[PDB]
Amino acid sequence: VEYRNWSKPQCKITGFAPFSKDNSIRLSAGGDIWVTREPYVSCDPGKCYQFALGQGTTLDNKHSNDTIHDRIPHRTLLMNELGVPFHLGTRQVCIAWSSSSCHDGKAWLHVCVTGDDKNATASFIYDGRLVDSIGSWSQNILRTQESECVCINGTCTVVMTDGSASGRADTRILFIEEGKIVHISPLSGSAQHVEECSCYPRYPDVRCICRDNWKGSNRPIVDINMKDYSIDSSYVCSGLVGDTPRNDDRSSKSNCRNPNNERGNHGVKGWAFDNGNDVWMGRTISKDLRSGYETFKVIGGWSTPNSKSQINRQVIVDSDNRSGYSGIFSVEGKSCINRCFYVELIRGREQETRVWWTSNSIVVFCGTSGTYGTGSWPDGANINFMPI
Amino acid sequence: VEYRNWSKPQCKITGFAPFSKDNSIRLSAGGDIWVTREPYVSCDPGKCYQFALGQGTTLDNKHSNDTIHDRIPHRTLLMNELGVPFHLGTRQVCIAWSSSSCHDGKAWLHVCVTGDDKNATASFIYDGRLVDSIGSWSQNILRTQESECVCINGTCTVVMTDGSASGRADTRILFIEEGKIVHISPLSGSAQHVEECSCYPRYPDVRCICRDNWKGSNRPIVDINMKDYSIDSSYVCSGLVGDTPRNDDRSSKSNCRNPNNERGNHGVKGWAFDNGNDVWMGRTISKDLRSGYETFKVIGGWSTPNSKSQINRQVIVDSDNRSGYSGIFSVEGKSCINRCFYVELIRGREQETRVWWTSNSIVVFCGTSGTYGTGSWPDGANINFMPI
Amino acid sequence: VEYRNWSKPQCKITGFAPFSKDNSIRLSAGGDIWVTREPYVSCDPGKCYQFALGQGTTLDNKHSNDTIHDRIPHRTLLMNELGVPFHLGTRQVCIAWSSSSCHDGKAWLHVCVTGDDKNATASFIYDGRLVDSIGSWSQNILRTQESECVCINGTCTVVMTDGSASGRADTRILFIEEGKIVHISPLSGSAQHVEECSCYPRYPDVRCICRDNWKGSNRPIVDINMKDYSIDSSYVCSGLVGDTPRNDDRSSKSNCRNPNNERGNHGVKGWAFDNGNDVWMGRTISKDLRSGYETFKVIGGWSTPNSKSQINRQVIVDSDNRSGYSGIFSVEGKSCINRCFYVELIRGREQETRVWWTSNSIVVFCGTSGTYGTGSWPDGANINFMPI
Amino acid sequence: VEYRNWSKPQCKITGFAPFSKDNSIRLSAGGDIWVTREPYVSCDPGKCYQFALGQGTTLDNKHSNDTIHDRIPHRTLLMNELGVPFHLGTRQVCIAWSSSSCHDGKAWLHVCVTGDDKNATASFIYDGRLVDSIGSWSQNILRTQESECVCINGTCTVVMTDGSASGRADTRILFIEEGKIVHISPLSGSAQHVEECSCYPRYPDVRCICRDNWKGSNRPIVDINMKDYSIDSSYVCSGLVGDTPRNDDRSSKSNCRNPNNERGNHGVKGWAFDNGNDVWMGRTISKDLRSGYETFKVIGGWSTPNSKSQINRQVIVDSDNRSGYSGIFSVEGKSCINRCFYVELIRGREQETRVWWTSNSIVVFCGTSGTYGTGSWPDGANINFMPI
Ligand SMILES: *[C@@H]1O[C@H](CO)[C@@H](O[C@@H]2O[C@H](CO)[C@@H](O[C@@H]3O[C@H](CO)[C@@H](O)[C@H](O[C@H]4O[C@H](CO)[C@@H](O)[C@H](O)[C@@H]4O[C@H]4O[C@H](CO)[C@@H](O)[C@H](O)[C@@H]4O[C@H]4O[C@H](CO)[C@@H](O)[C@H](O)[C@@H]4O)[C@@H]3O)[C@H](O)[C@H]2NC(C)=O)[C@H](O)[C@H]1NC(C)=O
Ligand SMILES: *[C@@H]1O[C@H](CO)[C@@H](O[C@@H]2O[C@H](CO)[C@@H](O[C@@H]3O[C@H](CO)[C@@H](O)[C@H](O[C@H]4O[C@H](CO)[C@@H](O)[C@H](O)[C@@H]4O[C@H]4O[C@H](CO)[C@@H](O)[C@H](O)[C@@H]4O[C@H]4O[C@H](CO)[C@@H](O)[C@H](O)[C@@H]4O)[C@@H]3O)[C@H](O)[C@H]2NC(C)=O)[C@H](O)[C@H]1NC(C)=O
Ligand SMILES: *[C@@H]1O[C@H](CO)[C@@H](O[C@@H]2O[C@H](CO)[C@@H](O[C@@H]3O[C@H](CO)[C@@H](O)[C@H](O[C@H]4O[C@H](CO)[C@@H](O)[C@H](O)[C@@H]4O[C@H]4O[C@H](CO)[C@@H](O)[C@H](O)[C@@H]4O[C@H]4O[C@H](CO)[C@@H](O)[C@H](O)[C@@H]4O)[C@@H]3O)[C@H](O)[C@H]2NC(C)=O)[C@H](O)[C@H]1NC(C)=O
Ligand SMILES: *[C@@H]1O[C@H](CO)[C@@H](O[C@@H]2O[C@H](CO)[C@@H](O[C@@H]3O[C@H](CO)[C@@H](O)[C@H](O[C@H]4O[C@H](CO)[C@@H](O)[C@H](O)[C@@H]4O[C@H]4O[C@H](CO)[C@@H](O)[C@H](O)[C@@H]4O[C@H]4O[C@H](CO)[C@@H](O)[C@H](O)[C@@H]4O)[C@@H]3O)[C@H](O)[C@H]2NC(C)=O)[C@H](O)[C@H]1NC(C)=O
Ligand SMILES: *[C@@H]1O[C@H](CO)[C@@H](O)[C@H](O)[C@H]1NC(C)=O
Ligand SMILES: *[C@@H]1O[C@H](CO)[C@@H](O)[C@H](O)[C@H]1NC(C)=O
Ligand SMILES: *[C@@H]1O[C@H](CO)[C@@H](O)[C@H](O)[C@H]1NC(C)=O
Ligand SMILES: *[C@@H]1O[C@H](CO)[C@@H](O)[C@H](O)[C@H]1NC(C)=O
Ligand SMILES: [Ca+2]
Ligand SMILES: [Ca+2]
Ligand SMILES: [Ca+2]
Ligand SMILES: [Ca+2]
């Protein structure tokens, strides 16, 4: 077994093709399925796995009541092969109300945060054993990516934040070797608030597109130098911005450098990736709510401030259906590294009627160099058919 | 590991012996089991797997209502070891309302079609990653075999159709290497309508027996030259024809060349294979409905037009019981390549109105050079005992 | 990997120690568990598996009604790791209302009989593929061991019967190499009726203790010469006889040669094995019904006609509780071959009329050279707590 | 594969970080989950497993009624990967109402005790086969650790007791090689009553911290010399004692040598381990009941009699929530051997009378050389939401 280097060029991308869907909520109405949120996907060299934060209960279960809450002690990281729904045989990998996972070519690293809001613990589990832990540095909800970390040549990197969700916070980039923290770098650059980074290998370095929860509806970028541990940060150049909420395309802005101060407060986890001067990105179709999901390329969207010429739009989830968090993962092919993404399809309380639970399913798409058509792949559950 | 070549002679066939049965619908009445249709079987070098298109729901589940519909975004390809029923731990391999799968000796290829009727996408997944995709070419339900594809020396072939189900359509034969489409050939020859091909290795080439949904109740043949990608097509010579609907045995015809224009409209997926001048074939026992299932050899049925001398009949499913789609798969033995088949046993709507769902179980038989008796192996569920 | 030879001495045996129990029926009252009967155990070189004939239904399921019947088309052979109860993820290995399985050191052989009573088919599946089949030779319920077959140096042997259960029948011993029948020997010797043999390796040969359903309450022995395929048969010498029904211990007889003509009609599958002049055997505690289970050694019980000197009695299931079929399996240790056995614990109809189903659990014990105490390990389900 | 030697220094310990939680009871209210008690954790060289004694039933099952009883024939040892809850696919490894398991680097050993109170049998199963057995030596509930045994250089050791729970008993230390008992040593030293030992490798020897059920609320130590099989015993020096019940912290004593005669009767399984002159230990927060769980270091707690200076306290389960048994396990890291522990979280009768069953979930923590915060990770089930 060799460490992954991800040392191939990025695949040609013309858009995205359907990859996986789990139908979690539909199945929940006729079977014992975990209540989850904050899912993601990560692949070992051979196969892909779906992850999510359980709520310590199945859906058709009185304990599913009031699972809207983000942090309870019973949350655990679930891990199944991609497309295997979270049934009762699912392994709970660690205790976590915030997580990141990645495979270095040899073994899995899991970063699992749990405990009190003001004094959380992050556990670092590698190759099936606890190797390290760190306590809260800002005493205000130590937290991490909710998507895959990235490892190059045996060094894995993960972005963590501690502090205010509505002001200056303390973001740190950890470097981890076989589960052991070997270095911690403070966030540097012009990103002013960084949450829930979606990171990808860009050999020899790592690049993250994140969520600004404070003043930006444009998405921050964090660049991680894997050689010298230096950090840089800015914002996606695209004038078509990626956060929710955001201004309408009529009036939205990004200058590549600063939070745009356009409905900056709050946000949603999302992703983008560069191809030369262009950017491929996803966002909710609604500028207001976590409804619908679309992808497109913005011509000059990586390099030209305020660029707004999009092309190659695809609807993933139509605007009449719920989405949620989304994130990137990378898959090594024969000659190139492909970029894929998942969309969390949130169902239940409070937005929807009848039910007392909050859960999600997932849909997953992967970059293609080929051709494709159109469709919409929403959660598909009928709220009227669900146990409450 | 080496690529499969299937470079052994076809096994001696005296008939077929029982191989597998999943009892899906019986189990559905007391357990959480997927609603499915369009099942098939395919084996890696070591063991066989059962596949089917899920309906994104279990049977004992309000979402099972109105699962008669062929295409919804929630359909996914399920894959279990043969004889493991589709329980909640089943892996959903891809998003698909039409599919084909095969193993090349090294890894699995899945061809998965989903999306809008007028603009579908086929994804090509190999060794657990998306390698290619193609969009609809005729804007009219791009679709494929619903049974195993065939790979020789690292090149896999699959037949796909796009266009009318009741007139001239656009059928293409794809050649795929490690998930990448390397060549596409148009259908050629005298077959006038080709659907749902059941294909098998006939080293060094591939041979398919398909469904003519337009003018033929005789089954089309598609011959695929794996060296130069050339295509030929015609019809099974046997005067005992394989489609449903069809004329009675007394008045049925085939001239090997043309659709017989005998109750040609509509059809059912099925199979046949050659042994010299003779043909082994299955069909529904009913000439009108998907009821019963029988196999037999037609003497001269491969090479003599309108041959009707049958022998070695076996009842697989008696005529009082429901069948459905059927297809071929091939299994490599020590010295020869064996031919096996599965039968889909459809239950529920529209025919059975006590329940609101549509699903199936499977029964599977394999070629034998030995001896055997008689029986009948239907679905076996009591419709009155079923959750509705 | 090498073929198993079983070429080690039989382990020292002082009695039996508890090995496994599945609690199938207790679990059935709170979970989806297969209805079964005719279970057995067989181990590959690494680990042991439990097998049984499913009834194509779970217990808490309307299809469980009237599962008293021995032969329906929906019966399939189930196979799990030993101690894993027959849940919905259990693999159905083949279609079978009578079966035998064994591992030759390289792969599994399964002998699976199904179809019409007067014209059954036995399928021979090896290394995951159908290799051979045979039809009924006496047109009267072709049938086999319901316990493990035995393979030495790549040749597996299995005993099959076709014909009357209450008169002269046609018993044959098959020799099978990688799934292919290479020789068939007729029964020879003085055993007059042979059913449901429990066989074990006695290098270089195989020895079976069976059920005489006709005139004997003493158990037949079948000796299989693996070199020249010759067959011999007689009866266990022990005056303490192993069948049910039987006479009481005071009046029972065996002359080693002939059926004893003591309540000879009917019987139950069981086992015994030799150690020099002595025999280790199990039997139901009741002489009338399949109630209770005991093991003991009979001193001179292998070599001395009508020997009744028992020692080392152990209660496996107390006489207040139901038993059923029992059979032998063999397990290779470091320096010796151990003998183990399972007991089928039958619940439901016809004896227990509150419920409409018939099913079983299992308990398993293995030979020990050590020491042990006493107990009773019955099924343990409360019939009043069961779904009916 | 090589035998484990555990020949690395003990890892630096600053405290404990969260590792695993199974949420068994919460899940039981919406899924088929085993009723258990007496859980533990043990890891092979790659992966950790959770074990527990089943009650031969699921929770939502009428058979769960009156599972307070410790010993029934239906109890079996369950084994899943750590964090996989005990679903219906769980393997029952052996018949056991008392158990210990460990991996020697090559294979699993299981020590499983079952049968009559006055005449129990312990089975020794290694590498999937029964290798040895021993009967009761004191005719009074032969019993063992309820946590992992320890193997060094292919020799595994386990502590067993037979005799009174409230007076002088007969404790023996067994030495087992590939499942075969090679030596038995009587308890020696000043420990006067030894139950339910929590043992760990301290190369080249093994050290156990146990439960005195008779005169001590201070915990006994058993030291096992793996070279000459000699045994020593005493009591943990710490004046902060580990048993429940016990005196309050102000009035509790230990002299390292004798049971303290302070509320000595009864107890609970627990653990401690040495670091130089200091001791790391866990205990219930309540001095009266199995409620809450805390860990801390006692400075001089290993070497100084009646030492009471604690530091590095952590709450694992707050005092408002139920705990139960706890035990140690050891995990080999790159350069050191880590110490971890599990806590049994008991729910139901007799304390909670709304329900009729008794079961548990688990939470698991591992030693860390890093930093951590605070929290509480109780069972989390709402008794009012449970099937009774
Ligand atoms: C079968 O499947 C294939 C493959 O999926 C389909 O082909 C794809 O079809 C897509 C839709 O036509 C196409 O993407 C489009 O590319 C064009 C550039 O050629 C781009 O303009 C499109 O983006 C606009 O339209 C979409 C809706 O389609 C809007 O959501 C989006 O916001 C864009 O609209 C904005 O810009 C327009 C142009 O300036 C304005 O006219 C419009 O009012 C709107 O303006 C707002 O935003 C501006 C900033 O962007 C701002 O200045 C202004 O003030 C407003 O605020 C879209 O990306 C794919 O390229 C194509 N794929 C391929 C490979 O060919 C095919 O159609 C399917 N066929 C069927 C029958 O199903
Ligand atoms: C135990 O098990 C074994 C193994 O399963 C059994 O042996 C098998 O038995 C099969 C049935 O006899 C046998 O297959 C038959 O082979 C003969 C040739 O030898 C063939 O004629 C049979 O086909 C006719 O009969 C079946 C029903 O059995 C019909 O479904 C079929 O359509 C055929 O009937 C048509 O042709 C006949 C002859 O011309 C006409 O009499 C009949 O009316 C009908 O005519 C219509 O169709 C014609 C076109 O074909 C058309 O010209 C006309 O106008 C009408 O429309 C069948 O294939 C197996 O070979 C044999 N297997 C082996 C290895 O021996 C055994 O019986 C079992 N034993 C018991 C006691 O259960
Ligand atoms: C703790 O556990 C250990 C290990 O499990 C226990 O030790 C075991 O204890 C067993 C019972 O004592 C013992 O087996 C016995 O061995 C003697 C020979 O030494 C043998 O005679 C015993 O067999 C008789 O008794 C059993 C009931 O125990 C009957 O079921 C059986 O049919 C036998 O009864 C017949 O023979 C008797 C003597 O000849 C007659 O009195 C009786 O009426 C009956 O006669 C009928 O059968 C005859 C043919 O057999 C026939 O001629 C006559 O006309 C009648 O029809 C039994 O096998 C184990 O050897 C021993 N194990 C070890 C390793 O020591 C220990 O007791 C446990 N302790 C506690 C307190 O739980
Ligand atoms: C964020 O998380 C971090 C990491 O978890 C937190 O840091 C940890 O904080 C712990 C609590 O302060 C600390 O452990 C403590 O260490 C001190 C020594 O420095 C030790 O004295 C503490 O033990 C006492 O207090 C705990 C409750 O905290 C009691 O349960 C315990 O019994 C001890 O109290 C007894 O002794 C005291 C002093 O002698 C008495 O005042 C008290 O009444 C009580 O006396 C009884 O027992 C005596 C025998 O011991 C007996 O003589 C007398 O008669 C009475 O019966 C505790 O171990 C950790 O070291 C620290 N961890 C690290 C790595 O720094 C941090 O606080 C969190 N952040 C925030 C803001 O909360
Ligand atoms: C959920 O819990 C709330 C109490 O917070 C209660 O009012 C409501 O009835 C519960 N829902 C159900 C379905 O029991
Ligand atoms: C299925 O849906 C139809 C149309 O809404 C309805 O009439 C029928 O009652 C439904 N079936 C069940 C069993 O709910
Ligand atoms: C089982 O079937 C019999 C015969 O049809 C019937 O009398 C009985 O009520 C059935 N049992 C149940 C529980 O439905
Ligand atoms: C449990 O058994 C007891 C004694 O038979 C009975 O009083 C009680 O009702 C049972 N509990 C349930 C929930 O059936
Ligand atoms: Ca924002
Ligand atoms: Ca047709
Ligand atoms: Ca008899
Ligand atoms: Ca005590």
Author numbering:
A (entry chain B), B (entry chain A), C (entry chain C), D (entry chain D): 82 to 469
Question: What does the article say, verbatim?
Answer:
Influenza A virus has two surface glycoproteins, hemagglutinin (HA) and neuraminidase (NA), that act as the major antigens. NA is a type II transmembrane protein that forms a homotetramer. The natural function of NA is to cleave the sialic acids from cellular receptors to facilitate virus release and from newly synthesized HA to prevent virion aggregation. Neuraminidase (NA) of human influenza H3N2 virus has evolved rapidly and been accumulating mutations for more than half-century.
To further examine the structural mechanism of epistasis between K385N and N387K, we determined the crystal structure of NAs from Bil69, SD93, and Mos99 to 1.54 Å, 1.65 Å, and 1.40 Å, respectively. K385N alone is unlikely to cause a change in backbone conformation, since Bil69 NA and Mos99 NA carry different amino acids at residue 385 and yet have the same backbone conformation in this region. Similarly, our result implies that the permissive mutations for N336H emerged between 1969 and 1971, since mutating residue 336 to His was neutral in Bil71 and Alb76 but reduced the virus titer of Bil69 to below the detection limit. In contrast to N387K, N336H did not reduce the Tm of Bil69 NA. However, the first differential curve of the thermal shift assay for Bil69 N336H had an atypical shape. Similarly, the first differential curve for Bil69 N336Y showed two peaks. These results indicate the presence of multiple oligomeric states, hence protein aggregates. The shapes of their first differential curves returned to WT-like when N356D was introduced.
